[PDB]
């Protein structure tokens, strides 16, 4: 098997979850990645 490539080079969503509580500490969408 050839490992898949997954490239975040277009808008994407994400969430950051705290493990003990499973709470959603943060959510967002990157459309234009500022530096």
């Amino acid at each position: 098997s050839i490992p898949p490539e997954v490239k975040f080079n277009k808008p994407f969503v994400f969430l950051m979850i705290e493990q003990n509580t499973k709470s959603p500490l943060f959510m967002g969408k990157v459309v234009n990645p500022t530096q």
Partner: protein, 335 residues
Amino acid sequence: NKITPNLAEFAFSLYRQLAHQSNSTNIFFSPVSIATAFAMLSLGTKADTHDEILEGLNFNLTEIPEAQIHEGFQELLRTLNQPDSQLQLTTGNGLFLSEGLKLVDKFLEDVKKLYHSEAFTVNFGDTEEAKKQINDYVEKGTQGKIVDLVKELDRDTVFALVNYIFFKGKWERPFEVKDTEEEDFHVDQVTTVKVPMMKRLGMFNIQHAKKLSSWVLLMKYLGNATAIFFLPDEGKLQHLENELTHDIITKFLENEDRRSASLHLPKLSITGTYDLKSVLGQLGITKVFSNGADLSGVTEEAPLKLSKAVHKAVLTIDEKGTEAAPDDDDEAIPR
């Protein structure tokens, strides 16, 4: 923690309102910080003013008793401030009160006990001094990430409630800086920018999910956190945004399986600043901002209303990990 599924649906509800508010811009916010600030504020409200707030945070009040909501937040906050040794995570709350204001003693007791709120007295009459005390507190809590938060502050403000989190996590396996290379990032069909693209060949919890028409990648931090990234197939972003639910996230988090993959992820720094009034109004939180607000649990001296609810959040992603910090600034005036 039993308030979790409520917080997760509140995250998706608020997200959808922010995406409908501006559908072609970066979004970044903290569902937990906003829910903490408004649940704390509900302790000073009564009747429908109160019930609208907790229902807007996706609590069913004829199902979960109010004491258990607040005790759920109390425990959440305690967990947040006791991470694994490998993760930096803190949260805090400051309640800046007009000097001389006669408060309902039970409010001050309840915010200290349940929300760990640090009460301060300030003279809103001296606008530069009051702004500095609030902004210094937020800058300290957010470890320098949110600076000079408050620029303009009404001399008649009765209280400013300020809630923050600080997060700094390390990837379980970091990227190597030598492998980062500038690549094209396709903002839209006619717009390409350059970004430093990190990369690594690793064992990832990675799958392409039919229900979301998206790749779904879990990135573990050392210690008690995970980031989940969703890359929608072409044309499927709005679909992905609409279809996320708490049950879907849970199923992804519970799966242990890993597979070999080449990941390319951009280094970035983004910020969101939001007036929460209209978006929370779409979620049903309306009366607390109005000429009918009942904040008589805060003070019985004169009626109040919440004039301002602003949220600011910053995110940095790089080869070492992620740093992030929100702050909520919710201000009340006499009505």
